[PDB]
Amino acid sequence: QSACTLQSETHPPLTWQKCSSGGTCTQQTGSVVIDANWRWTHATNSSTNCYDGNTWSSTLCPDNETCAKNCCLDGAAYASTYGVTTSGNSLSIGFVTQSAQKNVGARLYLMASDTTYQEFTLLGNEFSFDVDVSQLPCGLNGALYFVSMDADGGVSKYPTNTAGAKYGTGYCDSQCPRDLKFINGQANVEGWEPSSNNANTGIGGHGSCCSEMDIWEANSISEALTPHPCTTVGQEICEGDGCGGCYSDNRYGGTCDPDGCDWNPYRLGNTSFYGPGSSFTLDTTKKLTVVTQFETSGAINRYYVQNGVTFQQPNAELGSYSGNELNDDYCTAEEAEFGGSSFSDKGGLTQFKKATSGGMVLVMSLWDDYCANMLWLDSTYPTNETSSTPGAVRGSCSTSSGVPAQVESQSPNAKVTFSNIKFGPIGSTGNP
Numbered sequence: 157q158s159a160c161t162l163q164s165e166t167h168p169p170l171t172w173q174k175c176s177s178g179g180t181c182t183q184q185t186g187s188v189v190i191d192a193n194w195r196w197t198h199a200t201n202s203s204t205n206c207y208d209g210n211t212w213s214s215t216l217c218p219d220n221e222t223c224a225k226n227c228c229l230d231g232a233a234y235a236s237t238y239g240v241t242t243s244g245n246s247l248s249i250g251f252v253t254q255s256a257q258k259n260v261g262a263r264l265y266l267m268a269s270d271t272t273y274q275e276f277t278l279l280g281n282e283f284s285f286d287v288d289v290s291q292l293p294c295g296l297n298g299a300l301y302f303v304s305m306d307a308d309g310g311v312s313k314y315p316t317n318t319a320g321a322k323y324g325t326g327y328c329d330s331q332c333p334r335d336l337k338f339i340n341g342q343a344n345v346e347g348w349e350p351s352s353n354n355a356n357t358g359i360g361g362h363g364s365c366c367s368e369m370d371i372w373e374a375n376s377i378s379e380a381l382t383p384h385p386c387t388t389v390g391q392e393i394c395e396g397d398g399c400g401g402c403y404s405d406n407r408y409g410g411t412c413d414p415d416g417c418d419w420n421p422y423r424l425g426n427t428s429f430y431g432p433g434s435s436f437t438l439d440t441t442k443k444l445t446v447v448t449q450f451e452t453s454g455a456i457n458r459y460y461v462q463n464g465v466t467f468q469q470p471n472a473e474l475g476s477y478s479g480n481e482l483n484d485d486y487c488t489a490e491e492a493e494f495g496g497s498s499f500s501d502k503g504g505l506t507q508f509k510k511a512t513s514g515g516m517v518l519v520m521s522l523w524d525d526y527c528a529n530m531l532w533l534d535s536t537y538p539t540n541e542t543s544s545t546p547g548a549v550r551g552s553c554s555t556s557s558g559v560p561a562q563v564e565s566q567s568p569n570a571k572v573t574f575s576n577i578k579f580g581p582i583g584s585t586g587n588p
């Protein structure tokens with residue numbers, strides 16, 4: 157896709173801190189961009205839509221190459237269309253925003269410049285942020301995570317993409333999403349199937365894979381920490397059902413692990429650690445600091461801070477494993493106890509360390525789940541299982557919760573606020 161200028165594009169500003177060993181943090185002047193899939197896609201020389209509702213223009217988009225030649229992405233009204241606002245080091249994402257049209261959620265990337273994503277090499281570093289999940293009920297996911305996206309959004313690799321990072325191009329993740337309208341500098345109209353349950357989305361013949369570090373997938377009920385390896389570390393196109401993910405006919409595709417090695421304290425049996433009010437260690441009605449440490453071994457550590465009190469990740473006992481560290485011993489015990497081979501099949505934390513030793517882009521999003529109602533995060537999953545089945549219960553939410561049409565009507569003013577991002581070597585982000 158190219159970029160058009162019928163609607164002005166400015167990335168909302170967002171400050172963050174880079175911290176040094178031996179006690180100092182320095183302000184960085186960043187900004188955020190909305191992913192290209194949220195944007196208006198229209199003809200390069202008119203306002204004619206290339207995409208209407210969940211259907212491509214067969215006139216402008218008879219095939220993937222003609223479509224990209226004919227079509228451009230345009231600017232985004234971050235506050236009034238997409239419910240995205242910033243203040244200092246704080247980013248708020250609204251759930252349902254009513255303008256000319258209904259907008260649900262947003263996926264944003266942290267920028268280095270007007271034309272480049274900020275790249276972070278997680279390995280050896282820790283990432284700290286504050287979050288307010290108080291306004292996220294059952295069925296919603298305020299996510300903060302990293303993906304192995306190209307810094308320029310794909311411009312160098314696919315020079316037909318001249319829109320680039322400025323317009324939020326080049327997304328990939330371990331679901332190898334096929335809902336993207338542009339992949340690899342071409343459209344995704346070939347094999348497009350409009351969504352049965354979503355008037356605005358569809359699935360195309362191609363998807364976009366890469367390694368994914370899910371630091372934070374959470375609401376006021378449940379939180380999960382999950383690395384996902386891929387056999388190709390960075391961004392790569394995938395063909396149809398070879399993409400896997402929840403929207404392919406089978407979720408196990410050829411290159412990415414869609415399940416990950418997840419750590420949800422509730423799922424692991426600590427049902428009083430995280431939730432609303434005084435009865436939980438971490439009270440999700442109040443702001444929380446989440447610190448995630450990428451050990452040079454490839455293990456991942458976690459602690460939380462709430463009103464100045466530090467809490468380490470709670471201990472888990474799972475098979476032969478005892479500890480609070482996401483490491484290959486944990487991920488092997490998890491496959492032994494809860495089942496599956498996706499994570500180890502795709503190379504485990506050794507493969508995952510290839511991604512964290514390279515650049516990854518920071519993603520912040522709010523979404524509801526048109527595939528599985530977020531039950532995997534905050535309910536009993538699969539729904540036929542019981543709390544008698546270890547790992548079936550990931551939170552207290554009802555198995556009928558999280559239907560998009562329902563939660564959009566019930567809780568349109570739901571929101572997530574991410575703030576005070578700090579990044580530096582392990583041990584540094586408590587510095588002043």
Ligand SMILES: *[C@@H]1O[C@H](CO)[C@@H](O)[C@H](O)[C@H]1NC(C)=O
Pocket residue numbers: 425426427428429437467468469470471
């Ligand atoms: C849950 O975690 C908290 C914080 O570590 C701890 O105080 C409590 O004992 C744990 N409960 C169980 C059942 O492990």
Ligand SMILES: [Co+2]
Pocket residue numbers: 331
């Ligand atoms: Co995901």
Ligand SMILES: [Co+2]
Pocket residue numbers: 362395
């Ligand atoms: Co193909």
Ligand SMILES: [Co+2]
Pocket residue numbers: 405
């Ligand atoms: Co099919």
Ligand SMILES: [Co+2]
Pocket residue numbers: 433434435436437438439
């Ligand atoms: Co408390």
Ligand SMILES: [Co+2]
Pocket residue numbers: 485
């Ligand atoms: Co061992």
